[PDB]
Design a protein around this ligand. Structure first.
Ligand SMILES: *[C@@H]1O[C@H](CO)[C@@H](O[C@@H]2O[C@H](CO)[C@@H](O[C@@H]3O[C@H](CO[C@H]4O[C@H](CO)[C@@H](O)[C@H](O)[C@@H]4O)[C@@H](O)[C@H](O[C@H]4O[C@H](CO)[C@@H](O)[C@H](O)[C@@H]4O)[C@@H]3O)[C@H](O)[C@H]2NC(C)=O)[C@H](O)[C@H]1NC(C)=O
Ligand SMILES: *[C@@H]1O[C@H](CO)[C@@H](O[C@@H]2O[C@H](CO)[C@@H](O[C@@H]3O[C@H](CO)[C@@H](O)[C@H](O)[C@@H]3O)[C@H](O)[C@H]2NC(C)=O)[C@H](O)[C@H]1NC(C)=O
Ligand SMILES: *[C@@H]1O[C@H](CO)[C@@H](O[C@@H]2O[C@H](CO)[C@@H](O)[C@H](O)[C@H]2NC(C)=O)[C@H](O)[C@H]1NC(C)=O
Ligand SMILES: *[C@@H]1O[C@H](CO)[C@@H](O)[C@H](O)[C@H]1NC(C)=O
Ligand SMILES: *[C@@H]1O[C@H](CO)[C@@H](O)[C@H](O)[C@H]1NC(C)=O
Ligand SMILES: *[C@@H]1O[C@H](CO)[C@@H](O)[C@H](O)[C@H]1NC(C)=O
Lengths: 49, 596
């Protein structure tokens, strides 16, 4: 959901680091302006197309 | 970097969690509503607790972004809504006290019961018997006694609790920057930051008054005709110049005048329009009705329902052990799931209610692409107006003839149109003064200008002034008459039932203009038209992304609500009533009192 920059074609990225957005570096911990980069889908049979 | 990017990041996260949490809570609520069991209640409680807690922490976290550094004006709305709708300011003891007070209000309204005099043997509740008695029974003494007894047994208990509740809500409003809780309600229509479209909170008040200045003659002529007709039913009790007794309006509070149609039919000899027998002959079931509604919706160009809607929604009462509430509702669980919850009988009223609810479902589907915090109508009134405009065209004789329920041999002349317009009038026009009166009284009491010891005193004084209805039994300050109203006890804004009505006749008159229709306004259809469909859809898809003044402009062409279409709708009825009221006095006298 969050990356510093874009991706070159045919590329993969697996690194998981806390994406700092605020000016203060939060030293890789969860908190304000410091979100984990990997989100999660939620799948249930009752969803719509 | 700058505040804008950080706010955008925070919103991009918040939407993602909010979707899933809302889905879980709504699914739990639906599961309880279609399956009434204690564990379903527990699941509802858990899901609601999680949702409320999450909203609370998000409201706490959102405070770090000052709102004066946002110029996109789209992030600002989302930030404002999130900050407002989850912020608590009262102390813990006061907060739990208010929660207990509200729970007590709901419990006492649900559990209230009154029964026959000097006989504690058998007793009944408001919904089963009292409503039927006030809608059907013509006994003067029975209706008067029941009306007095319910108020005596409810408002007297509810008075001091309301006295504490108003104070607590007042300090809640004072803690924020609003002047009072009435201003907190009025802030819904507030519009700021846009040139040529700004709407101030106070202005609304003035506007309402101006509107009520123009609809007075129609209401008073209808009142005179109603008084003249009810003279026949109860000659001794009703005065030719006094206000009507409060216990002879066909319901508990006089909110609707529908029940008096049989007692006030203009031409009883002529047959009434009805299709119930026709549907019975053709062996109509629920799915046929809903498919007909869907075809009507398609015929204007709007897309029709998904497969999940047909599979998941339920339309017939399960019966047996499976018990569920049969109040018609349109659920939008989010994430692409829309359902309708209602129990269907083979009647014309259910046939119209199907269209009415499908309108809400289509409106919900319209703005699915907007962000989560902006998935709502432009104000509290647009949603109801959209859901109600279609029921008008659904019941027109032309649509019935095209569908085929009405025989082609049917004809139209004076009496049919007059009866239809009058039946519509006793439902639409009558409720406006009552709603305006209630809203104005609550505004005044929250303003604090009226002392407690005059609460009842003013309440009836304005009732004889505007509504033109006199109480049949005197009451002291012990009673709390407004507390007997369901919406007042449950803390619901009631002004939306006045802005909605004046909206809908603005919409219809617009669409019939685009449909190139000619003739009387009340005989209009938009089945084949498509320009009206796309024009409506253009406003429907907006959601909350724009000020409601702009949205109203994009459909009709005005920046404010107007009363002219409403009067234009009922103009033939106005002329006929003016003709009929030649020998009847117009205007009620406030000096008369039924109890000597
Ligand atoms: C900010 O937070 C507030 C409160 O926390 C939220 O406010 C709620 O908004 C919803 C959406 O409008 C309100 O829901 C509406 O309630 C009306 C009140 O009806 C009550 O009584 C009937 C019985 O007569 C019950 O069946 C019902 O459940 C209520 O208890 C309903 O009448 C409305 O239904 C209308 O629309 C449906 C289609 O949706 C039609 O089918 C119906 O016929 C009817 O016309 C509607 O359900 C809710 O009441 C508000 N809460 C309060 C406390 O007022 C905001 O949504 C929230 N904003 C955010 C998160 O952005
Ligand atoms: C206020 O903020 C919102 C959201 O941050 C801005 O909306 C964004 O507008 C841009 C273009 O105006 C959209 O870019 C478009 O993206 C699509 C792909 O989704 C692409 O196909 C288009 O060619 C275009 O690049 C962007 O998607 C949109 N944001 C969202 C969330 O939809 C808005 O512009 C801001 N207001 C002002 C005045 O700038
Ligand atoms: C919208 O178009 C449909 C399609 O023709 C109309 O349905 C026809 O209505 C006439 C009566 O006017 C019937 O004789 C036909 O049998 C109907 N055709 C079908 C396929 O059902 C419908 O009447 C139009 N809507 C309006 C308001 O005129
Ligand atoms: C309703 O709840 C009961 C209790 O768990 C459950 O057994 C049943 O499957 C649910 N659904 C229906 C339709 O009864
Ligand atoms: C309406 O539903 C029918 C199936 O009954 C489908 O063929 C049609 O495409 C739908 N209308 C639209 C606009 O998709
Ligand atoms: C009934 O309608 C006709 C229309 O031609 C009109 O001439 C007549 O005056 C009307 N009668 C009443 C009582 O409204």
């Amino acid at each position: 959901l969050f990356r510093k920059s874009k991706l070159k074609p045919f590329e993969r990225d697996i690194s998981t680091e806390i994406y700092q957005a605020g000016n203060k570096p939060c030293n890789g911990v969860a908190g304000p302006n410091c979100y984990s980069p990997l989100q999660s889908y939620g799948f249930r049979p009752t969803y719509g197309v | 970097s700058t505040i804008e990017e950080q706010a955008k990041t925070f919103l991009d996260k918040f939407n993602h969690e909010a979707e899933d949490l809302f889905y879980q809570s709504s699914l739990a609520s639906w599961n309880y509503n279609t399956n009434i069991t204690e564990e379903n209640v527990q699941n509802m409680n858990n899901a609601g607790d999680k949702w409320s807690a999450f909203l609370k922490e998000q409201s706490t976290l959102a405070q770090m972004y000052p709102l004066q550094e946002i110029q996109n004006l789209t992030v600002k709305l989302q930030l404002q809504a999130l900050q407002q709708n989850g912020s608590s300011v009262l102390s813990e003891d006061k907060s739990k006290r208010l929660n207990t007070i509200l729970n007590t209000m709901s419990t006492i309204y649900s559990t209230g019961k009154v029964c026959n005099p000097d006989n504690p043997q058998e007793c009944l509740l408001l919904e089963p018997g009292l409503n039927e008695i006030m809608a059907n029974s013509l006994d003067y003494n029975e209706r008067l006694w029941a009306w007095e007894s319910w108020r005596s047994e409810v408002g007297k208990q509810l008075r001091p609790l309301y006295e504490e509740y108003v104070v607590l809500k007042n300090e809640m409003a004072r803690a924020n920057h609003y002047e009072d809780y009435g201003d907190y309600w009025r802030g819904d229509y507030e519009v700021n930051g846009v040139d040529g479209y700004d709407y101030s909170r106070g202005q609304l008040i003035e506007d309402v008054e101006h509107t009520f200045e123009e609809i007075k003659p129609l209401y008073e002529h209808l009142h005179a005709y109603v008084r003249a007709k009810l003279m026949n039913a109860y000659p001794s009790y009703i005065s030719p110049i006094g206000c009507l007794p409060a216990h002879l309006l066909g319901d508990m509070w006089g909110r609707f005048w529908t029940n008096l149609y049989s007692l006030t039919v203009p031409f009883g000899q002529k047959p009434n329009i009805d299709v119930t027998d026709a549907m019975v002959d053709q062996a109509w079931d629920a799915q046929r009705i809903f498919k007909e509604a869907e075809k009507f919706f398609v015929s204007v160009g709007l897309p029709n329902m998904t497969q999940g809607f047909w599979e998941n929604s339920m339309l017939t009462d399960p019966g047996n052990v499976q018990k569920a509430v049969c109040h018609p509702t349109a659920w939008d669980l989010g994430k692409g799931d829309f359902r309708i919850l209602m129990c269907t009988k083979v009647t014309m009223d259910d046939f119209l209610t199907a269209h009415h609810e499908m309108g809400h479902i289509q409106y919900d589907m319209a703005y699915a692409a907007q962000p989560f915090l902006l998935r709502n109508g432009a104000n509290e009134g647009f949603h109801e107006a959209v859901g109600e405009i279609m029921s008008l065209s659904a019941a027109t004789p032309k649509h019935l003839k095209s569908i085929g329920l009405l025989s082609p041999d049917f004809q139209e002349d004076n009496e049919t149109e007059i009866n239809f317009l009058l039946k519509q009038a006793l439902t639409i026009v009558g409720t406006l003064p009552f709603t305006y009166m209630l809203e104005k009284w609550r505004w005044m009491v929250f303003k604090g200008e009226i002392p407690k010891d005059q609460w009842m005193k003013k309440w009836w004084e304005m009732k004889r002034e505007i509504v033109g209805v006199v109480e049949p039994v005197p009451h002291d300050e012990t009673y709390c008459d407004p507390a007997s109203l369901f919406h007042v006890s449950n803390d619901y804004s009631f002004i939306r039932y006045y802005t909605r009505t004046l909206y809908q006749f603005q919409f219809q008159e617009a669409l019939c203009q685009a449909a190139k229709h000619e003739g009387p306004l009340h005989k209009c259809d938009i089945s084949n038209s498509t320009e009206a469909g796309q024009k409506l859809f253009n406003m429907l898809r907006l959601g909350k992304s724009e000020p409601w003044t702009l949205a109203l402009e994009n459909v009709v062409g005005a920046k404010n609500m107007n009363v002219r279409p409403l009067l234009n709708y009922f103009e033939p009825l106005f002329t006929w009533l003016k003709d009929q009221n030649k020998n009847s006095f117009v205007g009620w006298s406030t000096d008369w009192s039924p109890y000597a």
